[PDB]
Design a protein around this ligand. Structure first.
Ligand SMILES: Cc1cc2nc3c(=O)[nH]c(=O)nc-3n(C[C@H](O)[C@H](O)[C@H](O)COP(=O)(O)O)c2cc1C
Ligand code: SF4
Lengths: 62, 129, 432
């Protein structure tokens, strides 16, 4: 929630990259459930969350 | 501007009696004047610039042999092209054919801006690119 | 009136006095070195004076563009329009051979935040989003420590530096991409979507981050901005050739005895810089084969060009290359030039975002062709084909990555075609 509040209200989708990174830290690797759970908290459709995970290299999908 | 024994020929051109068409194919046929729409699969527009003349379809059965699509209407594949509706609609009754005309559909101009893809307020901001 | 023998800068005029981390990089050391001093007066002078003194400085974009930073930053002198105004500092530093941004962040971060503060005031921005790359986690944490120190000291935040201005700095981490270094792609990645760059009929000054105005500036450019305000554009304009002022950093790497970093005055002779700061090419200067002047994007030049060339924008431009990021990579006579360039194209293929067709397909195609060139399994006609392909993607891509990948191929071809010819002949008679 501190990450989301860094961004302007109404564009909370911008927190996708840092929040998805947070799921990586407490899980090592992010499974599809982590990518779905990021979608619910950030209200972003899961497809857009899937785009970010596959595009950037650091996110360990395996 | 041509003195060639000019006489008053007001009555409409009625060449139908000369084209040799049988009586059946001259009244009971309803031709259609239309600008063909673009093939929705494609995006080009070079096929929607000339008015087309076509005859209403008729029976098309199957042969007792291997079974092609037989027909008995000679005016089935006849498609004519005209550069203007007035020329097209004039060729119909001059040849004596009942017609219906559909006006050309012009794609209305739509204002498109790339900056709208990333809008501060409006819901037109996209979620992917 | 003219300092023709440009170079050999002294410690007094050096900006990043704590470059090697030999002094306290916290607020106490930074203020000791001369930071956060009369900042309020800079704030109270007015944005016009800040912009005006940047033009006098003649500062050019130290990120791979070389644009007249004063002219670029002047694009938000327009009146307010309801939308918030935002500043963005580029800190990706993804270009190979570029290490300068890493050093300033983790050794003199307080200069950077002050740079955002004075920069934001000049451009009227509300906040600065420093986009540090994901790998620099320790650097980002070091950056945030300075931010917290500045916030507690009252330098930034509500009534920044006791001047009424309210400025905030959010340091946003990356998730791993070289394309995020691109300004519009960085603006995109901040917004949370895929890091593809956006086309520009519009510009960040009008439409940008969250749709609000923005301006992506390199870490070095903003970092030196406050010191320019303190010492003046006249002091900054004194150094460097005309239109080539300032003291640009230099990242020397490759086949050198002591690869390092140094803040040398611009328009410096290339031979001189390698000799003293770096230590000279391994095996002597005569062992040099080719040099990457300013990063992978900048095309290479051979030793013949390397004999006398000033390290700046214009001098390299007439030398069939560019200053770029001043990432000097030397390659000795023991270096497989074809193999090294093929690796650069391999890096570009692994970093293209795949949005536009020329960069998505052309770079991959150039990767496969150059791979055959390294082995020699090709024909002399392929060299010309590679030249035409590189031109096809040049200037036809959304962002400058396509041009950034075509230039190394063009640089290699025009300076080492006989090497390519010899390798293919070597492959030919071996496989007879
Ligand atoms: C593929 C690519 C990568 C780039 N990477 C960086 C980078 O890491 N850092 C940077 O400051 N500019 C980078 N740039 C340049 C930016 O797009 C932009 O021109 C510049 O950051 C603007 O700030 P400046 O005027 O201070 O250089 C890159 C450009 C391209 C095309
Ligand atoms: S040049 Fe490459 S990275 Fe840049 S927009 Fe096109 S595909 Fe994406």
């Amino acid at each position: 929630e501190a990450i989301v509040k860094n961004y302007p209200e109404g564009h909370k989708a911008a927190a996708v990259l840092p929040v998805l990174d947070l799921a990586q830290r407490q899980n090592g690797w992010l499974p599809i459930s982590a990518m779905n759970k990021v979608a619910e908290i950030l209200q972003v459709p899961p497809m857009r969350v899937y785009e970010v995970a596959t595009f950037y290299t650091m996110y360990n999908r395996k | 501007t041509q003195d060639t024994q000019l006489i008053a020929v007001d009555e409409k051109l009625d060449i139908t009696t000369l084209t040799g068409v049988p009586e059946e194919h001259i009244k009971t046929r309803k031709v259609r004047i239309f600008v063909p729409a673009r093939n929705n699969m494609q995006s080009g527009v070079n096929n929607t610039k000339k008015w087309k003349m076509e005859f209403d379809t008729r029976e098309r059965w199957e042969n007792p042999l291997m079974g092609w699509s037989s027909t008995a209407d000679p005016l089935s594949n006849l498609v004519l092209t005209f550069s203007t509706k007035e020329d097209a609609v004039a060729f119909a009754e001059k040849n004596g054919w009942s017609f219906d005309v559909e006006e050309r559909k012009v794609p209305k101009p739509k204002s498109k801006s790339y900056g709208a893809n990333f809008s501060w307020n409006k819901r037109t901001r996209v979620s992917t690119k | 009136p003219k300092k023709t023998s440009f170079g050999s800068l002294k410690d007094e005029d050096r900006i990043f006095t704590n470059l090697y981390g030999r002094h306290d990089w916290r607020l106490k050391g930074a203020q000791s070195r001369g930071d956060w001093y009369k900042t309020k007066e800079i704030l109270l002078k007015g944005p016009d004076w800040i912009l005006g003194e940047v033009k006098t400085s003649g500062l050019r974009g130290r990120g791979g563009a070389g644009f007249p930073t004063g002219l670029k930053w002047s694009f938000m002198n327009k009146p307010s329009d309801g939308r918030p105004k935002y500043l963005v500092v580029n800190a990706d530093e993804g270009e190979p051979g570029t290490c300068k941004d890493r050093e300033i962040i983790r050794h003199d971060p307080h200069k950077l935040v002050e740079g955002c503060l004075v920069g934001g005031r000049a451009m009227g921005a509300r906040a600065a989003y420093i986009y540090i790359r994901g790998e620099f986690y320790n650097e980002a944490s070091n950056l945030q420590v300075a931010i917290r120190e500045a916030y507690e000291a009252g330098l930034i935040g509500k009534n920044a530096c006791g001047s009424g201005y309210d400025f905030d700095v959010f340091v946003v981490r990356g998730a791993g991409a070289y394309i995020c270094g691109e300004e519009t792609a960085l603006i995109e990645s901040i917004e949370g979507k895929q890091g593809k760059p956006r086309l520009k009929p519009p510009f960040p000054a009008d439409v940008g981050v969250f749709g609000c105005p923005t301006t992506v500036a390199n870490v070095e450019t903003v970092a030196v901005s406050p010191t320019i305000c303190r010492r003046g554009g006249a002091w900054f304009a004194s150094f460097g050739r005309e239109r080539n002022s300032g003291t640009k950093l230099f990242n020397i790497s490759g086949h050198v005895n002591h690869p390092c970093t140094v803040e040398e005055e611009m328009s410096v002779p290339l031979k001189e810089l390698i000799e003293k700061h770096a230590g000279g090419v391994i095996g002597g200067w005569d062992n040099l084969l080719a040099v990457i002047p300013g990063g992978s994007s900048t095309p290479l030049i051979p030793k013949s060009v390397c004999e006398t060339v000033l390290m700046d924008f214009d001098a390299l431009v007439q030398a069939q290359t560019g200053l770029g990021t001043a990432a000097v990579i030397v390659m000795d006579r023991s270096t497989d030039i074809v193999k090294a360039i093929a690796r650069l194209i391999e890096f570009y293929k692994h970093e293209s975002c795949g949005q536009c067709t020329p960069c998505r397909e052309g770079v991959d195609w150039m990767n496969k062709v150059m791979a055959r060139f390294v082995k020699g399994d090709a024909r002399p006609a392929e060299i010309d084909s590679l030249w035409e392909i590189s031109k096809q993607i040049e200037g036809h891509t959304i962002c400058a990555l396509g041009d950034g990948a075509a230039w190394p191929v063009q640089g290699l071809i025009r300076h080492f075609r006989p090497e390519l010819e010899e390798r293919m002949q070597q492959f030919a008679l071996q496989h007879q």
